[PDB]
RNA sequence: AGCUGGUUCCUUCCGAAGUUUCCCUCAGGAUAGCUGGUGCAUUUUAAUAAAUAAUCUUAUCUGGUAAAGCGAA
RNA sequence: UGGUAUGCGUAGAAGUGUUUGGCGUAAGCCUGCAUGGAGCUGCCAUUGGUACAGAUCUUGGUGGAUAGUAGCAAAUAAUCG
RNA sequence: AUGUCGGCUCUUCCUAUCAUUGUGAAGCAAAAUUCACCAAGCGUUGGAUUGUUCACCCAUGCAAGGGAACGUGAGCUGGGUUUAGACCGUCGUGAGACAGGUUAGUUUUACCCUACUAAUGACAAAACGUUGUUGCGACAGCAUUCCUGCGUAGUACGAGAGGAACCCGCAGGUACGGACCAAUGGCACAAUACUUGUUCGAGCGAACAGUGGUAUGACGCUACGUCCGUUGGAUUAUGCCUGAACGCCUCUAAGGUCGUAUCCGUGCUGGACUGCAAUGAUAAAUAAGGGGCAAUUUGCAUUGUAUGGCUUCUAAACCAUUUAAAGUUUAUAAUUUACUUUAUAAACGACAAUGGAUGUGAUGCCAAUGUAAUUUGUAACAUAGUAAAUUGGGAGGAUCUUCGAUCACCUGAUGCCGCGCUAGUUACAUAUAAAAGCAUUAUUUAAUACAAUGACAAAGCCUAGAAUCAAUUGUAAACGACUUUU
């Protein structure tokens, strides 16, 4: 939601020219992080290993005002409430897992493996 | 190198007519022959020095007035003039054509590893064969310097330096070539493993 | 199609556009007086700093001017030119694409303000540039690195330039950021150019060697940057008469329905100032000796003429405004030089031999 | 409202006209011509020609243009 | 809507989301899967307020402009705390 | 609903060129002007009146050429034209008309997109990361203009009257453009003083009069102030050589010379966002390890090559050219740095040949004496005849290039693994090969070979950055950014 956001030096950490400090938004995300941590202690989840793995913010139903404008025009002035969503998770150890290989039978195929190995010299 | 046939064909731009060479090269790039063209200052274009000078001057008149940096690049170098001639003959607006341009390398005054390489002739491109007797012709490097090519002076020194390394290698090559033919000839008759294959070939080598 | 009807002179020359803010304060020469074999093995240029402007008086000679035997009072510039330290040598080969540097070779000891350039955060920096390159000098020398690099430069390199470095500490400008330039050695013989450079490592070269009183010099600076400004100030378009609805200081007419096209050539609001510019044929009044001190404490007679006798120095009462202790070797230049207060300007040898008899006057 | 705008699924097959006349007609109709559909009567032009329709040719008429004429009106 | 398949159906109807599978030149159809909760459909005839993209269409909703660009600037205008 | 005309402002081009450059004509003697050419690079103005382009005048300057985008109303103005008020002449019964005069009469919107002007900048691409510093110059734009005085000059030239303000050379200014603020000038620090009105009891010193007024007025900005604006080639116009057509002759047909304010570079300006080069440090610090040479080396993996060893491949390599009798060479006799130069004799006499290979340092597909989706192993003869390793020193090379703290060559020394041997002819033995298949191509392979890349745990070498943000400068600026900083 880039424009007409001017520019801040301090977003060069994130490699992007355009930064803002939007204080009210940051406070509400803070509250809900602390709620989730409080919930985490109740479940007996490890405090150190909490990483945020999901935040999803979606738009809530607008509250309606209307301001009254030049030449008897009325045009809406609307507030934007949010649906904020957060999920915290514990840091997991590297999960691998394994799959098959349903390969070869045949005419040149039996003769592939078996000749190439058996009566074939394998140079180092 | 590795190709359908040779991935590098080093082509001598000497005594080639500019559009004749450009068109045959354009075909070769589309075919996947990946060619390098060297000595584009030695490249010739028919029509008197003066006639070419005025033709080439007509484009710089062409200039995108609003921002001329969107506007037509009037490529001074003989290598880049060759490059423009090939590029126009190729559909360079397509991604196929981009591949084909990348297959092409263009150098004025044969550098790096290309000098111990043989500069192949394209005989259709040859000016001496195709062009009629007593017809005056222009040399592209002369034309280049008029339209503002800085490096006419520069390449001439670099070419002379190259020619000198190319002279000493030639001299030793010719000396070596004598001594290789005697070393075949003297062992040849002296048993028969050279008499067997040469005279059973017996063609004319 | 109405004409201009009165044919007018196009406000603002197209040959300084497109007016974008300057990248490098260390002015990049576009041009050097070749290397005409025979002559000195001296640096074409020096980096100086503006100390400002003094005002001066001299008798003017030129045959047949009627400025003859009458004094003329002339605007002045005063540039702080403290002896540049040669710290390196670069040699360039002409290739058909352009001049390519092969080699930069460095003085064993690079002295802090010469290192400061390489760093934008000095107090967090470990200062470890150039530890390992100075360690070339510990080992074997030119049999593994240093003279092998220099030899390569002798072998081909058609043009040799010397990396020369400002003593900013001598100027009480709070910068500390001494400024790097490459300066072409005009010197007859390529081989001699490198050799004088090897010798010149960690050695200072004074202003006096390259330059002489009443020599023609070019002064090359970035200009005064002065904001986003109005169309009227920038391109020198005539201010629309006061009857103008909603904003008198524009350019009225971009142009013409056909072509459907804003031309560049139309006076627009965009950067007026911060531009590299070379102005050429600025004469030397004086090369001023900063000198100093045996037991009798000099800085005496820097503002001195044979006619004044009155000691002191070029320093105006209350040290030059914004700049100003000005303790040093100076080049006093004939009066208006490109570049603001506290700025880097490179002083240069004139490209060509001025028969323009106002200089060759030896003025006193 | 003879005007302007819009008119709601598809496929198949055939397929126009801006012309005639009259009209306060001439931004429109009616009317004729062109169009489709519905078929009907007979096929030697039809179901397992000695009857034509309309294009050449031929035979038989017409014409005042091109050209020619002005020492033909 | 008349008739009918002794039609289907809360053991999941209709509705609807749907890289389920397929049919038809198409109009369009069926089916799977998920959601669902109370009713519904095919065929033959029978009637229409019968199928939409538009009409400076209507009515409701929603974007880009723009999480912010216009601006929220006249009467100085606060401020310590 | 495509915003009339002019004037203000601002753009670029065009010539059919008035001036300026370089030139050809002249019934051009000089001066002067006229004609025509290459030429639009550079000028072409300040006013009175008109709404006026147009027009008409005045004044200067050598000269006050003409056109195109009915340019240009979210640029202005709204003056003429062309609304609603209005007056008058004419006409009309009247209303009302008039393309007839006259007067007053709302110029709305950009914050989108593009263009443009300025301002930040990411990713990857990787003909070899990061980051910083330093550079190149592709490409685009492009600019200096004109006069006068002195001088050539009372001369050339002219019977005279007059008369080259004429290039060399010299000084100044003009017009244009770009800088710079020292002086000089301009502005106000609401600085300092003074002053009025009011208020703080008076006083000091202030406050209020939305900067109270007034005089002066700095850091700073900025003028009308001052300073600075390069130099060649190509060649047009054109004047010309040599010389045929046309025995001759001729600036032209061939060949050849000089030659523009042109053009294009030099120069001047942006700087290819990452097009490219050079160079530096190359981390993270140890209870750690991290990166680096990794081009590496191993299990193993990925991918290309050749794909049935291999049914491939090649950065030595047919010159140095005017060029269509132009020309590639050898040898003898001379000559040279140069297949250069000279005389004799020949020769591939743009043939067919030749153009693939002489694979032109005689490659391959060979080694393999069974040549292969096994490798051949082992014996003799005689001829031709092969070589494996290491270290030191002296000099040399690099044009967008696969490692310029790299790769050679030569010369000397050290010793001894004898590791390989090949071709020819000939002996001895054998696995693959018998891939079922009579239709063997079909879904169409890979042991191996070579080249690159990888990285799980591990292994074998080396080395110990900074950038950006905060804070900071003012040389910088709307904000990023720039320049400084600890």
- Hey, are the CB atoms on B108 and C264 less than 8 Å from each other? no
**CB-based contact C264 B158, cutoff 8 Å:** no
Which of B109, B140, B154, B155 to mutate: most C Cβ within 10 Å?
Answer: B154
Distance CA C287, CA C214 (A): 9
Task: Name the maximum alpha-carbon separation found in chain C.
Answer: 82
Among candidate residues A90, A92, A96, A83, the one with its CA nearest the CA of residue A55: A83
Q: How far is CA B197 from the centre of its chain?
A: 38
Instruction: Return d(Cα C12, Cα B18) in angstroms, integer.
Output: 42
Cβ neighbour number for residue A116 with a 10 Å cutoff = 10
Q: Which nucleotide is nearest to C75 (CA to C1')?
A: F182
Residue A79's nearest nucleotide, by CA–C1', is E67
Q: What angle do CA B28, B33, B37 make, to 5 degrees?
A: 75
DSSP state of B2: B
C-alpha count within 13 angstroms, C-beta hemisphere, residue C254: 12
Give the chain B residue nearest C263 (alpha carbons): B66
CB C217 within 8 A of CB C283: yes
Q: Using the CA of A59, give the nucleotide whose C1' is nearest.
A: E67
What is the structure's resolution, reported in angstroms to one decimal? 6.0
Nearest Cα to Cα of residue B15 among B51, B50, B40: B40
Cβ–Cβ < 8 Å for C108, C200:
no
Residues in chain B within 8 Å Cβ distance of C259: 65
Cβ distance of B66 and C95 shorter than 8 Å: no
Tokens of A15: 């490699």
Q: In the PDB record, what is the listed experimental method?
A: cryo-EM
Gap between the Cα atoms of C96 and C183, Å rounded: 23
Interface of C with B (CB under 8 A): 94-96, 259, 261-265
Comparing C-alpha atoms, which of C312, C285, C309, C282 is closest to residue C297? Answer: C312
Evaluate the CA torsion angle C35, C37, C43, C44 in order and state its sign.
negative
- Distance (Å, rounded) from C-alpha C7 to C-alpha B59? 29
Torsion sign over Cα B157, C41, C39, C154:
negative
As a rounded value in angstroms, the CA-to-C1' distance for B15 and F215 is 88
**Pairing state between β B35-38 and B9-12:** parallel
Tokens of C212: 């002489």
List beta partners, residue A78. Answer: A64
B65 vs C94, C96, C263: nearest CB: C263
| Beta-carbon-side half-sphere exposure of residue A53 (alpha carbons within 13 Å) | 8
| Continuous segment of H or E residues that includes residue C79 | strand C76-80
Measured between alpha carbons, how far is C269 from C263 in angstroms, rounded to an integer? Answer: 14
Which of A88, A66, A86, A61 minimizes the C-alpha distance to A76? A66
What values do phi and psi take at A43, rounded to 5? -80, -20
Q: Quick count: other Cβ atoms within 10 Å of Cβ A123?
A: 4
SS3 B58: helix
Distance C185 CA to D5 C1' (A): 83
Quote the strand ranges of C191-343, DSSP E: 203-205, 216-222, 276-288, 330-334
Size of interface B-C (CB pairs under 8 A): 26
Give the number of other Cβ atoms within 10 Å of residue B9's Cβ. Answer: 19
Record: contact C96-B109, CB cut-off 8 A = yes
Q: Do B77 and C94 touch (CB under 8 A)?
A: no
| Short-list C342, C340, C50, C77, CA closest to C223 | C340
Among C267, C270, C272, C262, smallest CA distance to C237 is for C267
CA atoms within 13 A on the CB side of C95: 12
Q: Is the dihedral of CA C222, C225, C228, C231 positive or negative?
A: negative
Residue A86 pairs in a beta bridge with A55
Contact across the interface for B108 and C261, Cβ inside 8 Å: no
SS3 sequence, chain A?
CCCCCCCCHHHCCCCCCCCCCCHHHHHHHHHHHHHHHHHHHHHCCCCCCEEEEEECCEECCCEEEEEEECCCEEEEEEECCEECCEEEEECCCCCCCCCCCCCCCCCCCHHHHHHHHHCCCCCC
C102 CA → D48 C1’, Å: 105
**Consecutive H or E run containing B28:** helix B18-31
Helix (H) or strand (E) run with residue B162 in it: helix B152-188
CA B126 to chain CA mean position, Å: 11
N-to-C CA span, chain A = 61
With residue B161 as reference, give the H or E element that holds it.
helix B152-188
Query: How far apart are the C-alpha atoms of C206 and A110, rounded to whole Å?
Result: 87
Q: Quickly list DSSP for C231-264.
A: HHHHH------TT-TT-SSS-S----SSS----T
Q: Do residues C21 and C37 make contact, with C-beta atoms less than 8 angstroms apart? A: no
Cβ separation C261–B66 shorter than 8 A: yes
Q: What is d(CA A15, CA C229) in angstroms, rounded to the nearest whole number?
A: 30
CA distances from B70 to B64, B65, B67, C255, C270 (A): 7, 9, 6, 20, 20
Query: A73 φ, ψ to 5°?
Result: -100, 140
First-to-last CA distance in chain C?
60
Q: Which chains touch C (3 or more CB pairs under 8 A)?
A: B
Closest CA to C315 of C303, C307, C306, C305: C303
**Closest residue of C to B153, CA-based?**
C96
DSSP B61-93: T---SS-TTSS-----SHHHHHHHHHHHTTTTT
What is the rounded distance in angstroms from the CA atom of residue B103 to the CA atom of residue B99? Answer: 6
**Cα pseudo-dihedral C264, C267, C268, C274, rounded to 10:** 90
**C96 with B67: Cβ contact below 8 A:** no
* Closest C-chain CA to B158: C95
Half-sphere exposure of B205 (CA within 13 A, CB side): 2
Tokens representing residue B121 in the block: 């002739």
Nucleotides on chain E that have an atom closer than 7 A to a protein CB are: 62-63, 65-70
Residue of B nearest to C259 (CA): B66
Distance (Å) from the alpha carbon of C98 to chain B's nearest alpha carbon: 8
Contact assessment for residue C160 and residue C9, using Cβ atoms and an 8 Å cutoff: no
CB neighbours (10 Å) of residue C100? 10
Element (H, E) at C197: helix C190-199
Strand stretches in chain B, DSSP E: 9-12, 35-38, 44-46, 105-106, 119-120, 137-139
Q: How many CB atoms lie within 10 A of CB A27?
A: 10
> C29 φ, ψ to 5°?
-50, -20
A58 touches strand E (CB under 7 A): no
Structure tokens at C300: 């005496």
Task: Answer whether any strand E atom is within 7 A of the Cβ of A117.
Answer: no
Assess contact for C267 and C231: CB atoms under 8 A: yes
- Structural contact between residues B35 and B25, judged by C-beta atoms closer than 8 angstroms: yes
């Amino acid at each position: 939601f880039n424009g007409g956001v001017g520019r801040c030096a301090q977003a060069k950490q994130w490699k992007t020219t355009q930064g803002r400090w939007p204080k009210k938004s940051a406070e509400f995300l803070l509250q809900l992080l602390r709620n989730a941590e409080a919930n985490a202690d109740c479940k007996g989840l490890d405090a150190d290993r909490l990483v945020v793995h999901h935040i999803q913010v979606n738009r809530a139903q607008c509250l309606r005002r209307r301001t009254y404008r030049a030449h008897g025009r009325i045009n809406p002035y609307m507030s934007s409430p949010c649906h904020v969503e957060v999920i915290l998770t514990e840091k997991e150890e590297l999960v691998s897992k394994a799959t098959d290989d349903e390969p070869a039978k045949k005419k040149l195929s039996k003769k592939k493996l078996q000749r190439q190995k058996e009566k074939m010299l394998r140079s180092e | 190198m590795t190709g359908l046939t040779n991935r590098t064909v080093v082509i001598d731009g000497r005594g080639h007519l500019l559009g004749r060479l450009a068109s045959v090269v354009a075909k070769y790039l589309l075919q996947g022959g990946k060619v390098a063209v060297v000595r584009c200052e030695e490249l010739n274009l028919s029509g008197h020095f003066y006639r070419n000078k005025i033709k080439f001057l007509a484009y710089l008149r062409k200039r995108c007035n609003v921002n001329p940096a969107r506007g037509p690049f009037h490529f001074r170098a003989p290598s880049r003039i060759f490059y423009k001639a090939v590029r126009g003959m190729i559909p360079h607006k397509t991604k196929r054509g981009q591949a084909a341009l990348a297959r092409l390398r263009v150098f004025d005054g044969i550098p790096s590893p290309y000098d111990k390489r043989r500069r192949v002739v394209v005989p259709i491109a040859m000016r001496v064969l195709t062009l009629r007797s007593d017809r005056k012709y222009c040399q592209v490097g002369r034309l280049s310097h008029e339209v503002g090519w800085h490096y006419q002076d520069v390449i001439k020194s670099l070419e002379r330096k190259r020619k000198a390394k190319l002279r000493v290698t030639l001299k030793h090559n010719r000396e070596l070539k004598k001594l290789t033919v005697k070393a075949r000839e003297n062992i040849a008759k002296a048993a028969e493993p050279f008499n067997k294959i040469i005279k059973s070939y017996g063609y004319e080598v | 199609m109405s004409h201009r009807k009165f044919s007018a002179p196009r406000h603002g020359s197209m040959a300084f556009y497109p007016k974008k803010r300057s990248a490098r304060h260390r002015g990049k020469v576009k041009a050097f007086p070749k290397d005409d074999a025979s002559k000195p093995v001296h640096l074409t240029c020096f980096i100086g700093y503006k100390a400002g402007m003094t005002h001066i008086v001299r008798e003017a000679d030129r045959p047949g001017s009627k400025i003859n035997k009458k004094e003329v009072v002339e605007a002045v510039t005063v540039l702080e030119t403290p002896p540049m330290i040669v710290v390196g040598a670069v040699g360039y080969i002409e290739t058909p694409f352009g001049l390519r540097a092969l080699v930069n070779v460095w003085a064993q000891h690079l002295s802090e303000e010469c290192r400061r350039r390489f760093y934008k955060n000095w107090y967090k920096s470990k200062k470890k540039a150039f530890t390992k390159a100075s360690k070339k000098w510990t080992d074997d020398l030119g049999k593994k690195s240093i003279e092998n690099d220099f030899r390569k430069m002798l072998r081909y390199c058609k043009v040799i330039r010397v990396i020369a470095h400002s003593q900013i500490r001598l100027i009480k400008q709070r910068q500390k950021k001494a400024h790097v330039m490459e300066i072409q050695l005009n010197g007859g013989s390529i081989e001699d150019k490198v050799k004088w450079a090897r010798e010149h490592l960690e050695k200072p070269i004074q202003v006096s060697n390259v330059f002489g009183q009443d020599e023609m010099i070019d002064c090359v600076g970035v200009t005064k940057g002065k904001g986003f400004k109005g169309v009227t100030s920038r391109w020198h378009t005539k201010k629309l008469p006061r009857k103008t609805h909603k904003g008198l200081r524009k350019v009225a007419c971009i142009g013409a329905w056909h072509p459907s096209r804003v031309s560049t050539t139309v006076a627009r609001a965009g950067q007026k100032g911060y531009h590299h510019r070379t102005e050429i044929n600025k004469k030397i009044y004086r090369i001023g000796a900063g000198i100093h001190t045996k037991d009798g404490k000099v800085i005496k007679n820097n503002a001195s003429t044979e006619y004044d006798l009155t000691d002191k120095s070029i320093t105006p009462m209350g040290g030059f405004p914004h700049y100003g202790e000005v303790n040093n070797d100076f080049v006093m230049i004939k009066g208006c030089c490109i570049g603001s207060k506290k700025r880097i300007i490179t002083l240069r040898k004139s490209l060509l031999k001025h028969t323009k008899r106002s200089a060759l006057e030896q003025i006193k």
